[model samples]
Target: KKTPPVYPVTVPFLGHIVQFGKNPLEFMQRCKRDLKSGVFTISIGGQRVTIVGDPHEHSRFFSPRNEILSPREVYTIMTPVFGEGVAYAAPYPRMREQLNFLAEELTIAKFQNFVPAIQHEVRKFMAENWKEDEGVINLLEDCGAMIINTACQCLFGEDLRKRLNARHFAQLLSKMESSLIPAAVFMPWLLRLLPQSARCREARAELQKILGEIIVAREKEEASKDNNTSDLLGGLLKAVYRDGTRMSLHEVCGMIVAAMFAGQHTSTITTSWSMLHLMHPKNKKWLDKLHKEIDEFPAQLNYDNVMDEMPFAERCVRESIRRDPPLLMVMRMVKAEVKVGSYVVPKGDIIACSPLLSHHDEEAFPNPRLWDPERDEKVDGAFIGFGAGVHKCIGQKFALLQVKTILATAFREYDFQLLRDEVPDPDYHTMVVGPTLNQCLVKYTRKKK
Candidate 1:
């Protein structure tokens, strides 16, 4: 008789939180190496979370009706930043309404309108900062600011975007970084009791006030505009109850913050990683080919045609994202008793899946450690970067547009070099991975040709 696959026993008291939280990548890899299975158990934040890697498991988690395993329960950690009314934390019916708006609004055609705006912001960035500096520049910081600005311009009009002080956005991200970590030692309420000098305490209130102002102002602008151009928020405003009542201002604000929160950190990291990975000698050849190929393509590569061609650059995105998934884990609750390769995990178990780990699976991706994009080969179930199934990232089309636009611009203007050879290991303490250092220094010179 064949033995059924099983995970390693959960450690008592300490559980796996220390090992898992301290170094998630190492912990998961170790579990995979030792367990010989794609599933592992980590007791984290006083709960047992079954960490799964198989794509089938991912489908299983998201397959059942969204009602079964609520995104709200799994993403409750986001409430401090996303607020209670955000789609991720909101109750089922309301979240469904929000999701519908997101789906309809982010259609390819709707997103294309923002390309010129995004490019304008990028050109401005290059002019101000990257102008004459053949000297070292921080790619991550520049890229982060670029994406944030682009998001603002596209999500809200440029005039409204300009009203947001840059430092306020940075502080919002600061609080958001701390807010998502599931730590029993530091609950949201406990942060309030700390001294005035406490970073978390100061950040929470500051972000709320600042974000509130931005929200109120945008709502006012939207209401006042007689011929306002529709953005994601505009589409969301069109959502109505059975009685045709619109979402409240708070609900709209939640959706707006959700859009911003979802895009900013992940987009910045991937854009930085794509540049870092492409600066390599071998990858430079691919980059050059991509540059030549894109130059000859349509004059305006909008949402419709961008993803249709340019396999290698798409490969570059695939490999870079596989190498470093900005959000390391996707957490969801088990809606029912599901059997994953003989392991019968119970319902209501907090299930976690790692795109970084799944992408590295040797069975799915041979020579997984190597940064080779050719191996991507358009494997249907291979890529987990944007996730799959019903809850797939609605903004992926927009993300691709931003990536193409940025990479296209980078190659057109500058001959670049990385300050460091490898994309540095990200500091995982921030719920998402980012460099502990402020900037990614890379030397570059404007192309003489």
Candidate 2:
């Protein structure tokens, strides 16, 4: 267990960076097989990158709380877009409280009307944008637009939408995101190589100003006597810490940014993949089940329609994520040495468990490539799509509801044909993995109603 058997570096300068970046699954598989251990280390820019490729060992990686295997240091790369000294940039207790508030804000009671809110947003997209009886579209980009509209429709108020619509708001975040490199947590100099200010920062500044103005105006309206409007923004504004302190304005803005940013690309990728898999010729049985699940529902769906019913559609979404998880790997800095199976991960090591790697493990998921909606994980706790234990996603249920509802709404009216014979291959290079956009092209035609 001494440093978890290193995969011999081809060269110390670059280490395994090139190979791992180009194809991570292949390299991880190679090291696991050749080294004869699922838990092993690989090099990346002089950092010891250890992976829990063993599904059985996942608990060891995810069970420990933040301080033991802290996520903040690894998440510093998100600081620029997430804004200064908030959430992951703050102290552990503060981060926990801040994140906990955002989590509670998405509770089912708070969003009882979200089903129709999402329905109209999606139904409107289909009616207006997908106007023609048949049209060609980029499934990836269209789904992205749907995600933004639906998310904003629920999260923001009318005034907020009028001032900064969903599309523009998303574009701003993307600008700051361009300033990030996935490895910046370990290799800070990568940002310098990216050449500061050649990219982003202003977008965030602009976003901060816009959000601030909206807050002030709402207060101004209330000062003059008001009709109260409810929104996630308003909800965060009222969040109080245990010590009886309202969250700072900056903290509120940061949380809103985090809320909007967290699930955007991931949800888009999932909705796209779920549709791609179901619409494919090979998976008609699952697609039929999906239709059956939704066919009986009324035109206006409610929370119960999505939450209590629609198990088969939820299965389709889960299977899509299992097949191609949006997050390739879940990594944390080893704050203190912890035992993971037979190995003791050293402090300061960048230990990780990959969703892509584990989801494909033959022992846990039989015929890993086969898209079977009826399939169950052969091993318990093997599916870490939204993560597990203390790190389990708080927005897990909300994200799934959005995807399943979007699927039901879309397929009810239209039929999609993948232009290519096969589903798009997972684009694995980035931290947020997904189907390749170029390969995600598809044709959509109105179903006979």
Top-lDDT candidate index? 2
Q: What TM-score fits each model?
A: 0.86, 0.97
TM-score of 1: 0.86
The residue-level lDDT of candidate 1 at 14 comes to 59
Worst 10 residues of 1 by lDDT: 185-194
lDDT of 1: 0.68
Clashes of 1: 0
| Model 1 lDDT tens row, 115-183 | 777777787888888879486788887888888877777777444455654446666666655544456
lDDT of 2 by residue, 222-241 (tens): 87667587788888888899
